[PDB]
Amino acid sequence: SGILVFDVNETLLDLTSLSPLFERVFGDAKVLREWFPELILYSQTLTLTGLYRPFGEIAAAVFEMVAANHQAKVTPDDIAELKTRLTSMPAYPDVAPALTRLQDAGFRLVTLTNSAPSPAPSPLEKAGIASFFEAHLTVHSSQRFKPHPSVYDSTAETLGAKPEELCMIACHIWDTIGAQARGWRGGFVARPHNTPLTLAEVPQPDFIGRDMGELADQLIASLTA
Amino acid sequence: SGILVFDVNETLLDLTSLSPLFERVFGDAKVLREWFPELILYSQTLTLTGLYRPFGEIAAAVFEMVAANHQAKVTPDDIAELKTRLTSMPAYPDVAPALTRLQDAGFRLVTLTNSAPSPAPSPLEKAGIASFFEAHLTVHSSQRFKPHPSVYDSTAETLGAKPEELCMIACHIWDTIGAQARGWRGGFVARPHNTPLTLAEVPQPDFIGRDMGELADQLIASLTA
Helix, strand or coil: CCEEEECCECCCECHHHHHHHHHHHHCCHHHHHHHHHHHHHHHHHHHHHCCCCCHHHHHHHHHHHHHHHCCCCCCHHHHHHHHHHHCCCCECCCHHHHHHHHHHCCCEEEEEECCCCCCCCCHHHHCCCHHHCCEEEEHHHCCCCCCCHHHHHHHHHHHCCCHHHEEEEECCHHHHHHHHCCCCEEEEECCCCCCCCCCCCCCCCCEEECCHHHHHHHHHHCCCC | CCEEEECCECCCECHHHHHHHHHHHHCCHHHHHHHHHHHHHHHHHHHHCCCCCCHHHHHHHHHHHHHHHCCCCCCHHHHHHHHHHHCCCCECCCHHHHHHHHHHCCCEEEEEECCCCCCCCCHHHHCCCHHHCCEEEEHHHCCCCCCCHHHHHHHHHHHCCCHHHEEEEECCHHHHHHHHCCCCEEEEECECCECCCCCCCCCCCCEEECCHHHHHHHHHHCCCC
16 A cells, blocks of 8 residues: 655644643743744754754754743753653654554654654553554654755665655654655645645645645545546 | 955844844744844745745745744735845944944955846945945846855855955854855954854854954054054
């Protein structure tokens, strides 16, 4: 049927579980939506410039920067809470039902994350969904973040797969863009506060769902002519 | 003396002049600080995936995306206003004085922006500060956005300059990191809602100033051994 490569943070695991930390430190949970694109921004900046630190370290550094930008006090305990929450985000309820159906339709399932390899128990293990996946891959071996071509190419190589066999699934259009640039298909799931970017010459996702069940419907349906 | 290469948007020209558009369309001026890093994020994504569209086109697309994420109505007129405002940000009042001093101290002054080449009058001309600069350079000749190495390298080649002769001045640490990765010096100027990122093995700016006059003071002082 093919191999479906899933983004983890926000796509499978619920990022809004971080909201209480932002509420407390900033007086405003919506600061999550300023911090997160800054984290992705700086991960891509490190990659473009030939630098690498683990994603978690960038997350902490960016949280401190955004705090300073808001003149908000931040403590070592705040940074510890950020690490705690980022590594313990729960699975959305729509995930396990969808992954079950995808398996039964013949798809192989793997994950690919910017997050560095985790001590056991990993966030996916803690969320109870790790066992759906045959492999758990990270950008850590590449020392480059998404959407750098190395990340997708090394993932295809590791799986012994050609791009025509692969489909990247994410709620982040930057990730599907990255994979489609390497000849993979892209499947977009529309988690809250995520919309595709519509821009000339930017490829649109091959599949789209408002939730994981609807995306899985489209993937499975596509098998039958 | 040295060649000082200035970032334009937010560094020289006041990005908070866009606040009234965000207040009207979103009911929240703070959405500026969600939209701007998203714009930079997507400019880097396109660069990483081998695509180029003019910065202004990306800015319009990202404005439409952020509007959809907030369920905020956007019209053709709003996009026209974004264009008006983005291409006409006024200079901070600290800029002309500081540029005057730097010229007096014998520095050559150049601009380098992600924005595409502009019909006359340019944003810098409207702001009344274009004539301080011996060249006004853009990422157009590189077809890649900051901080990709091609942008800095093309700039050095265009100026007939060695990296050691160059200092990038910005209120965006991603821009100073980009330039310092190519052997330039970096000067950071604090602007509201911009502070440095501290991360192990990521280069820190060579100079830091709380505003442009203070940075200029330091750059000029450094000449006295």
